[PDB]
Amino acid sequence: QSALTQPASVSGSPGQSISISCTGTSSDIGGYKYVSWYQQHPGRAPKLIIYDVIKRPSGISDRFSGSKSANTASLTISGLQAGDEASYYCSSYTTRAYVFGSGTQVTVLGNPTVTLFPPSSEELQANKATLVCLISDFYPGAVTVAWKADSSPVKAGVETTTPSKQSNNKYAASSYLSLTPEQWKSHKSYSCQVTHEGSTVEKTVAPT
Amino acid sequence: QVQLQQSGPGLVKPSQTLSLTCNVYGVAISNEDYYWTWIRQHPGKGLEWIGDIYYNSGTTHYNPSLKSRASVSVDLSRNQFTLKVTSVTTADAAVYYCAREASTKITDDGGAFDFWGRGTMVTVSSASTKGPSVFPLAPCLVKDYFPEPVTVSWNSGALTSGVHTFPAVLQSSGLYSLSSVVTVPSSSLGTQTYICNVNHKPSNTKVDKKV
């Protein structure tokens, strides 16, 4: 099955124009004018943005444009803005079958953001305490979320989800410290440390 | 003008049959300008065309990587079409979308997938569904559910700030937890009611928790 090749990632700053390539053969892109493009935000259904190479369906703004040259089709986004950060897929008719491209992640370049929420009265009433460390808005995607409590590295109950090739949201990450009661009232735990290529944000937040 | 509404279980046991349904509104499935497609997406991967049906086509049009395990049925009086995958394996876990594919022989949206269902996430596991316990964060996090996903809203969509919902975390017990963060005026707290609406479709559980 001869597929459609897209770059894994493309980035630009707000207001710029960017282009996404989609390379097939003469039996798909080059054989037919029935190339289309789709936008997909994380955790949401794809959305048609271009069809018949160059045409916009209803509701799609003129910042999206399509073209093709020989066996490669291109999606151009003008006036990049934060809402354009998303995955983009091309598709083509072939011989009858359809094929999607491998997908391109568009990053709009616009200090990791760390948000700490300590265990609440309702949780602790329910014999369960959870430390909520939520990080967002960092690029590139590699971040290391470590934990400490009592100035002491603790890892008994640490669950961590960071972006990977096999995740939907590549710009946010989560980490929780679940644990038995009174370990939060034992002392002024805790601190959530997050490393991001030399950018170490250790946020200490202690409930009492 | 068209809407596709998907249904079907979010949890299938291994070796059993996945059955997903797509109710079409705005065009008859017998309309010969359109093909009816199923597409799937593994976690973090790209879109994979599974196959399509065409009302006057009895031929099997399937992605050969499916290895002939998927078929389709149509309920015309319900204007509905259903994907069945037999003897499912862990590799069948994915989000499944139904979509309308306009024929190349028509101008409007010709050759493209111009309307999409909202998707159904399918987990293949022998573990049993568990509805969540939702915890208000005074003055919100959803804990100990299986399988994914959960959706969270506030005051039935009438609250939209910021808002971001963060990835779930998986515990050693095999259950998930997550949270979605929001902020509101500090003066309008003790008087206005804040209800979080958590929908865990796999357990068909909806829970509204006053905060």
Numbering used by the authors:
A (entry chain Q): 1 to 9, 11 to 27, 28A, 29B, 30C, 28 to 93, 95I, 95J, ...
B (entry chain P): 1 to 35, 35A, 35B, 36 to 52, 52A, 53 to 82, 82A, 82B, ...
Reported in the publication:
In this study, we isolated the neutralizing monoclonal antibody CAP248-2B, and used structural biology to characterize its epitope which spanned both the gp120-gp41 and gp41-gp41 interfaces in a manner distinct from other antibodies. CAP248-2B was predicted to be derived from the IGHV4-31 and IGHJ3 heavy and IGLV2-14 and IGLJ1 lambda chain germline genes, and displayed modest levels of affinity maturation, with 13.5% and 9.7% nucleotide mutation in the heavy and light chains respectively.
We determined two crystal structures of the unliganded CAP248-2B antigen binding fragment (Fab) to resolutions of 2.0 Å and 3.1 Å respectively. The CDR-H3 and CDR-L3 loops of the 2.0 Å resolution structure were influenced slightly by crystal packing, and a comparison of the CDR-H3 between the two structures revealed a potentially dynamic loop that flipped between two distinct conformations bent at residues Gly100D and Gly100E to flip the Asp100B and Asp100C anionic pair ~180° between CDR-L3 proximal and distal orientations. In both structures, the angle at which the CDR-L3 extended from the Fab was stabilized at its base by germline conserved hydrogen bonding interactions with CDR-L1, as well as a salt bridge formed between CDR-L3 residue Arg95I, and Asp50 in the CDR-H2. Structural analysis indicated that the CAP248-2B paratope was conformationally variable. Divergent CDR-H3 conformations that were only seen because of crystal packing may represent a level of plasticity that could have evolved to better accommodate Env sequence variation. Conversely the additional flexibility observed for CAP248-2B may contribute to its low potency.
